């Protein structure tokens, strides 16, 4: 086509989606990770994760307001990944890398799994 | 704005 | 912080949100523009437009499944702007620029209004 | 991935 493109548009959309999440506006699901609860938008979770994409395209699960993750999933690792989904920034540290990689593998977030693998390989 |  | 950033993340999220819109997945509102209807996600509309941000933060309107726009709004201009919201690409042409600018002013999409003004000024 |  002959379209023009606004370079910062995608980043501005994601920033506003994160502002709606912080103010709990139009969040339609609570993700339960052991004792911890995280509110989010189903559409953003699906856009970022192969696991959520599969869950919310399922004809019964698409209607659930609560999703319980596997008990092996670490709440801090989930929190770091949820923050990444809404910001593009990943808080990857020596103390959390193993939990972040395991959660990214479970959530099917291939770009996160890739950088965790590279950061681990460099430390070996 | 740019030409993509 | 000491975060790492994935450059293409925001663009990849927006691409997936557009794929969900095309397949009518988790769309929660229909925007009526005279005889035409457009399905979308309330969160994306709010993230892109000052008008939708005001509508869907209103305690009564946030629950509506149908929103009727002002009868002066051109359906093609709306369609072009809805496509821009979900892609960052604006199909601006001599034949649609006036309708696109008027719709962007109504929707409160300041970056679109700005480029329309500049494209018009250059043609004068 | 980059240092933002
Ligand atoms: O590593 C990842 C990140 C990811 C996201 C999604 N999401 C979608 N993919 C295709 N169309 C749609 Cl509509 C969505 Cl929402 C699926 C798989 C994966 N894997
Ligand atoms: O030109 C524009 C584009 C736009 C978007 C929004 N959206 C939001 N702004 C602040 N926080 C939040 Cl949570 C959202 Cl969703 C408001 C005004 C405008 N004006
Ligand atoms: Cl990823
Ligand atoms: Cl805009």
Let me know the angle formed at the C-alpha of C79 by C101 and A24, rounded to the nearest 5 degrees. Answer: 95
Q: Is C54 helix (H, G, I), strand (E, B) or coil?
A: helix
Residue A87, token pair as written in the block: 């910001």
- The owner of tokens 């979308």 is C40
Decide if B2 and A3 are in contact by the 8 Å CB cutoff.
no
User: Where does residue C66 rank: exposed (0-12), middle (13-18), buried (19+ CB within 10 A)?
Assistant: exposed
Its sign, for the CA torsion A80, A86, A87, A89, is positive
Domain total in chain C: 1
Is C2 part of the contact surface with chain D (CB cutoff 8 Å)?
Answer: no
CA distance A38 to A80: 11
Measured CA to CA in angstroms, residue C11 lies from A12, A81, A99, C17, C47 at distances of 10, 17, 26, 10, 14
Spatial distance between the Cα atoms of A67 and C24, rounded to a whole number of angstroms: 22
DSSP 3-state of C90: strand
The alpha-carbon radius of gyration of chain B (Å, integer) is 4
Neighbour count for residue C59 (Cβ, 10 Å):
6
Q: Which residue of C has its CA nearest to A40?
A: C43
Residue A5: which domain range?
1-124
Resolution (A): 1.9
C89 bridge partner residues = A5
**What are φ and ψ of residue C25, in 5° steps?**
-95, 120
Interface test with B, best of A2, A4, A9, A10 (most B CBs within 10 A): A4
How does DSSP classify residue C92? Answer: -
Give me the residues of C, 65-124, that contact B with CB < 8 A.
89-90, 115
Residue whose pair of structure tokens reads 């962007």 in the numeric block: C104
Q: What is the CATH number of the domain that holds A106?
A: 3.30.710.10
CA angle centred on A16, ends A13 and A21, rounded to 5°: 125
Q: Residue C101 to residues A5, A16, C44, C107: CA-CA distances in angstroms?
A: 16, 23, 20, 10
CA separation for the pair A10, C11 (Å, rounded): 5
């Amino acid at each position: 086509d002959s379209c023009i493109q606004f370079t910062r548009h995608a980043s501005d959309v994601l920033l506003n989606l994160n502002r709606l999440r912080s103010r709990d506006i139009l969040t339609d699901v609570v993700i339960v990770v052991s004792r911890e609860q995280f509110r989010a938008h189903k559409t953003v979770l699906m856009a970022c994760s192969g696991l959520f994409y599969s869950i919310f395209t399922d004809q019964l699960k698409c209607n659930l307001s609560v999703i319980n993750l596997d008990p092996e999933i670490n709440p801090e690792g989930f929190c770091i990944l949820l923050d990444f989904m809404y910001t593009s920034r990943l808080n990857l540290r020596e103390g959390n890398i193993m939990a972040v990689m395991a959660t990214a593998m479970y959530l099917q977030m291939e770009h996160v799994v890739d950088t965790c693998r590279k950061f681990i390989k460099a430390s070996e | 704005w740019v030409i993509p």
